[PDB]
Inverse folding.
């Protein structure tokens, strides 16, 4: 057990080298006591969530609200020792959070328990440790029985953990309270008045005289004012309060636009000697919630542009990371947000600190539930015995923060409509008031919503509760905003949460229809803001209801950030696991309503076009441009389309705002799509251009671009950098619908913390190296390590050019000093005999994370380097420092012939690409138009695989394709009958012995007393499983329809549904192109099945009525094709025109290492009777070259691999 790194710091981090183990096979007995052997358990750094790492489980007790991420019981164990320098003084273990019911042992004894999840709790450890220097053993059980929440929460110790080491005379846990009483009056004198209250706990064995010195440091460390107290005795083993007062001349008021803060340092003095010190940063600021004039700060009127936010950080899971939260806050502040309503649980310390730095208000939510529990294992289970303790803990922790403006007490409480509920609310407000008084209390209520259209009368007890609290908040109740102001003038009202509407990034379905809680096939929602839940509204309506009313303090949009779990429009739909409420997706990419809110709430000019520009030709498209400018006009490919405008409206009390005559807050057009560029220009009332924006039609996927949020991060082991992997075309325009699979490889002084795309309906695990792009983007998270250096991020996609980006990791000490931290590498790819264009100036990144654009000189480039296909590196110089620049160059293109292969239907021409990609050995994928020579029927007349030449437009050499053969070819029409046929064989799961199976293609349907052509499965035993018919053909023809004619009687009923499968050779495959009308007890039904290999085609049907059988008079299936059923696995293999040494079907790799200077080898292979083989040459200096075979109907494949690399030079 290693010793803790104590050297004098008051609070010591404790996140290092824990050991973790989840319970999967029953309770792990004995883990609590030191005697356990945990050497097999995984080592781990502490702040983490062990639910986010697991795979989404459909059967998990975690309902769809929790995101299907399993929970359970987990154990933490850490063994450690204590240095002598720390021996002989008070020691206490502080946890900032453990999700549920965590019982912590120590040295084989119980240390305590804490049910509530989101509160920091502490234990006094001083006595229990071994003073001998022997290794201690700390264990932290967590019992998170899964059905315990309404949103994803994570599990385990998801917040930092510290040891606090202090003198026996020390400040209490939160023994300091800084205020500015009557600051509103004082500021008129240009003088702030500060009052300090301090609590000192003397744990020594005897009372001692105690003194305090306090100092007020400005933001730059300059002393502002100091105070010292008269020495007074401090009793033994108890708390002795102190108090001081002072003034601050010319105070710098805390504000959103200037979040200035002061620092206070206390110095407990005993015997004329410092014995303990403490720090709390505070801020001087006055705010007033008025019942008529609305919210105001420091005497300035303001609207609370608010946003509800959950604790979850997305790819990181519930685990807290300082920069993750800071990034969320920064994105919100960019949106123009003013306040954050931390939802349904107290905020984390990092969130509070980020709000203080950035200048965002905060509202702390105590509980989601009182005594009555909303889920079986929720906090309501423990509410009675712990509500007071938890309220005290939260308010005590957060009281000093300048950002916190309001304590909230509940949300959507069932008990709010009962007398006991009123008693509970009074108790809660009493407990809150027992500690803090300079902040209103609050409750979040929804029961007043009623019908959303009329002012609902208030329930008896709800008025009592609203009178109990100081400020009242309403959920989704815009229909009461002004009515309750009239009926209760003393009330101060604000929108607790509004505009619950569902969005998905880049999805633009249903341009004109406004739904309400409607599911969709794709499991997505529209970004047009036409869609929302039943009890919510569109953001336009909710914002109009708020802007119009002066007395309303503001609103808090529900869910600024998309969070895991709670997929409301898709209850019980496994692929859907995430919310849709966010204005910013889980990864952090803003959805268009982000830009709507930016237009509405921000001041500076802007403009943003909503839909992408990759639609079909000729169709009208709904294009609407959010903006706060007075005029905007679209310009499509240089021609204008219409100059829309707003009306300079003014509210009743004179608040300016912009809006159209209709009453919409955004401008709109209906444009017939035409590929090109669509640019929007914003112009003020005088016509001067103010801002611009554009959207361009994206071409085919070309390359994967990587951009980092910030390329300089601290080497503290937890600083994060967010890297956006967006797929772009050749011109660098993000493809607006790409979804390819991106594989991330990261090496250096950092690790891949998480990867994301933000797709709500994707169950791809968060903690992995690969992730599918969604709507053309994906996110990868890299976290630095303790060691300074560099982090290299490499991302690659099949058939696309990879890319690399470097993140520089500097030391915390250097971060404050502007010194060179690194120089970015330049990537260039050119064709053969193409001179790379090296930049004349380069970006130079310093520590302190700034600066750029330094001049350079580049070393000479030989013609041999680029005149031939290959790779090489170029070096240069920089005048900023002696660090050597660097640049890589790739020289690859089109030289010679390019092959291809495929399989095809009978008669119909093969589906070939008219823009076939040209790739070569050690080359690159280059796409150009290819004219495949017009393929007639006769080419199939010869065995094996027939060749076709493809003429390429704009290249030197021509392409080719080898198409597998099916021999005979023919076409037919009106095939409805045959005199006698050998093709239509029929075999069925069950045939009633009294009924024939070959009646399904007799040619005439039996609707009357005519000969009864009818299959039937009637039996005394039930047949609820249904029945199917397998039809065989030896007719080389096409299939275009499937007509099913149904018969019913007292024993049989119609098919419930149709499901069809087919196998060529060995294994089954499913059919597409159904086009099935409504299935009912009706005369007819129809389908439009396409051509399919039909050695045997099986269609299964379930009876429509439980307890009723099935019968069919006819089933029209016509033809069959053989494609690859008769083939087998790989047969031939050759390299360099010679036998491949070391080859084998099962051997995982062939060690074909090349001497240096020997060019990469060509490879040829084939399968028995030419199964489709993906012939790919070797293209990488490292790694391997692999061959694969497509066999059967895709139900199997075989792997072959070659170890291609060059020996030492």
């Amino acid at each position: 057990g290693n010793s803790v790194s104590y050297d004098g710091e008051r609070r010591v981090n404790f996140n290092e080298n824990w050991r973790f183990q989840r319970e999967t096979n029953g309770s792990i007995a004995g883990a609590q006591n030191p005697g356990f052997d945990d050497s097999s358990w995984r080592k781990l750094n502490l702040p983490h969530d062990w639910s986010i790492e697991l795979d989404f489980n459909k059967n998990s007790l975690a309902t769809h609200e929790g995101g299907y991420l399993d929970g359970g019981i987990g154990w933490y164990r850490k063994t450690f020792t204590i240095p002598e320098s720390m021996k002989g003084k008070r020691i206490s273990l502080d946890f900032d959070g453990v999700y549920m019911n965590s019982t912590t042992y120590l040295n084989g004894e119980v240390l305590g328990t804490y049910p509530f999840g989101y509160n920091a709790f502490s234990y006094d450890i001083s006595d229990k440790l071994y003073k001998d220097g022997r290794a201690n053993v700390l264990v932290v059980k967590v019992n998170n029985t899964q059905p315990s929440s309404r949103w994803y929460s994570g599990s385990g110790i998801y917040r930092n953990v510290y040891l606090t080491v202090t003198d026996p005379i020390h400040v209490a846990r939160y023994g300091t309270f800084v205020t500015t009483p009557n600051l509103e009056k004082s500021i008129k004198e240009d003088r702030a008045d500060v009052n300090i209250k301090t609590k000192i706990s003397n744990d020594a064995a005897e009372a001692k005289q105690v003194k305090i010195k306090s100092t007020i440091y400005d933001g730059a460390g300059n002393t502002v004012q100091t105070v010292e107290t008269e020495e007074k005795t401090a009793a033994a083993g108890t708390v002795t309060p102190f108090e001081q007062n002072t003034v601050i001349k010319q105070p710098k008021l805390w504000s959103i636009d200037k979040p200035y803060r002061y620092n206070l340092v206390t110095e407990v003095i005993v015997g004329g000697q410092t014995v303990d010190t403490y720090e709390t940063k505070f801020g001087v600021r006055y705010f007033k919630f008025d019942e008529n004039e609305g919210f105001s700060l420091n005497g300035e009127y303001m609207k609370l542009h608010g946003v509800s936010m959950h604790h979850d950080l997305g790819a990181l899971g519930a685990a807290t990371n300082a920069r993750g939260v800071e990034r969320q806050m920064q994105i919100m502040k960019d949106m123009g947000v003013n306040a954050i309503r931390v939802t349904h649980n107290p905020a984390s310390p990092e969130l509070l600190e980020a709000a203080n730095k950035l200048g965002l208000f905060i509202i702390e939510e105590a509980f989601d539930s009182w005594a009555q529990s909303k889920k079986p294992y929720d906090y309501g289970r423990f509410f009675n015995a712990w509500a007071e303790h938890d309220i005290k803990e939260m308010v005590d922790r957060g009281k000093n923060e300048p950002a916190i403006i309001m304590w909230s007490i509940g949300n959507e409480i069932y008990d709010t409509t009962n007398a006991a509920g009123v008693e509970t609310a009074r108790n809660l407000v009493g407990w809150v008031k027992e500690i803090d008084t300079t902040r209103p209390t609050t409750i979040g209520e929804d029961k007043t919503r009623g019908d959303k259209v009329n002012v609902t009368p208030i329930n008896s007890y709800i008025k009592e509760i609203f009178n109990i609290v100081d400020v009242v908040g309403l959920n989704y109740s815009e229909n009461n905003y002004d009515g309750y102001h009239k009926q209760n003038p003393s009330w101060k009202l604000y929108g607790s949460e509004t505009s619950s509407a569902t969005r998905s990034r880049g999805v633009y379905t249903h341009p004109y229809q406004y739904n309400q809680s409607t599911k969709y096939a794709d499991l997505q929602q529209s970004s047009y803001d036409n869609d929302y839940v039943g009890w919510g509204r569109t953001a336009e309506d909710a914002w109009k209801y708020d802007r119009d009313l002066k007395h309303i303090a503001g609103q808090f949009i529900w869910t600024g950030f998309d969070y895991i779990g709670e997929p409301t429009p898709y209850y019980n739909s496994y692929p859907a696991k995430s919310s849709y409420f966010g204005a910013v997706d889980t990864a952090g990419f803003p959805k268009d309503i982000f830009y709507y809110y930016q237009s509405q709430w921000k001041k500076e000019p802007m403009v943003h076009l909503l839909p992408h520009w990759n639609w079909k030709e000729g169709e009208k498209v709904r294009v609407l441009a959010y903006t706060n400018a007075s005029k905007v006009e679209l310009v499509l490919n240089g021609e204008s389309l219409g100059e829309k405008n707003y009306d300079n409206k003014q509210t009743s009390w004179g608040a300016p705002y912009k809006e159209t005559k209709d009453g919409k807050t955004y401008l709109e057009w209906a444009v017939p799509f035409k590929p090109g560029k669509l640019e929007a220009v914003a112009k003020d009332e005088n016509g001067k251009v103010i801002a611009r924006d554009q959207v361009v039609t994206a071409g085919e996927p070309a390359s994967v671009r990587l951009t980092a949020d910030r390329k300089v991060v601290k080497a503290d082991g937890t600083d994060l950098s967010f890297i956006t992997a967006d797929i772009v075309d050749s011109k660098g325009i993000v493809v607006p619908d790409a979804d390819h699979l991106i594989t991330f490889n990261v090496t250096g002084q950092g690790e891949l913390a998480g990867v994301d795309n933000g797709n709500a309906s994707s169950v791809e695990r968060y903690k992995d190296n690969k992730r599918k792009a969604f709507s053309g983007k994906a996110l990868a998270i890299v976290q630095s390590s303790k060691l300074s250096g560099k982090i290299t991020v490499h991302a690659s996609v099949a058939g696309l050019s990879s890319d690399s980006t470097s993140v520089f990791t500097v030391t915390p000490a250097d971060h404050d000093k502007k010194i060179v931290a690194g120089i970015d590498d330049v990537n260039l790819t050119v064709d053969v005999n193409e001179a790379p264009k090296l930049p004349s100036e380069i970006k130079v990144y310093y520590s302190d994370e700034s600066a750029a654009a330094k001049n350079v000189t580049w070393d000479e480039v030989d013609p041999k380097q680029y005149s031939t296909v290959g790779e090489f590196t170029v070096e240069g110089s920089v005048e900023g420092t002696s660090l050597k620049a660097k640049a890589f160059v790739i020289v690859k293109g089109i030289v010679a012939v390019k092959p291809y292969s495929t399989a095809t239907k009978v008669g119909v021409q093969p589906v070939l690409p008219e823009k076939a990609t040209l790739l070569y050995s050690d080359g690159t994928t280059k796409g150009a138009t290819v004219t495949w020579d017009e393929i007639p029927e006769d080419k199939l007349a010869k065995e094996g695989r027939f060749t076709v030449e493809g003429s390429v437009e704009g290249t030197d050499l021509k392409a080719n394709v080898y198409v597998r053969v099916t021999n005979e070819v023919k076409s037919v029409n009106i095939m409805l009958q045959e005199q006698g046929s050998a093709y239509p064989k029929l075999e069925a799961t069950f045939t009633n012995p009294a009924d024939n199976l070959q009646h399904l293609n007799d040619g005439i349907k039996s609707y009357t007393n005519n000969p009864v052509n009818r299959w039937t499965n009637w039996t005394r035993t039930p047949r609820d499983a249904g029945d199917s018919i397998t039809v065989n053909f030896g007719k080389k023809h096409v299939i275009n329809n499937l007509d099913l004619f149904v018969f019913t009687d007292s024993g049989t009923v119609v098919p419930e549904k149709a499901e069809v499968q087919y196998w060529d050779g060995t294994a089954w495959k499913d059919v597409e192109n159904l086009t099935q009308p409504s299935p009912y007890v009706v005369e007819k039904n129809e389908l439009t099945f396409d051509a399919v290999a039909t050695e045997k085609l099986k269609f299964h049907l379930t009876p429509s009525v439980k307890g009723k059988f099935l019968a069919l008079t006819e089933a029209e299936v016509y033809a069959d094709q053989i494609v690859m059923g008769e083939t087998a696995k790989l047969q031939s293999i050759t390299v360099n025109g010679k036998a491949l040494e070391g080859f084998d079907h099962a051997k995982k790799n062939y060690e074909l290492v090349l001497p240096y200077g020997s060019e990469l080898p060509k490879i040829e292979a084939a399968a028995a009777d030419n199964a489709t083989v993906t012939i790919l040459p070797a293209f990488s200096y490292p790694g391997t070259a692999k061959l694969f075979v497509t066999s059967e109907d895709g139900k199997v494949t075989t792997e072959y691999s070659i170890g291609v690399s060059t020996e030492e030079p």
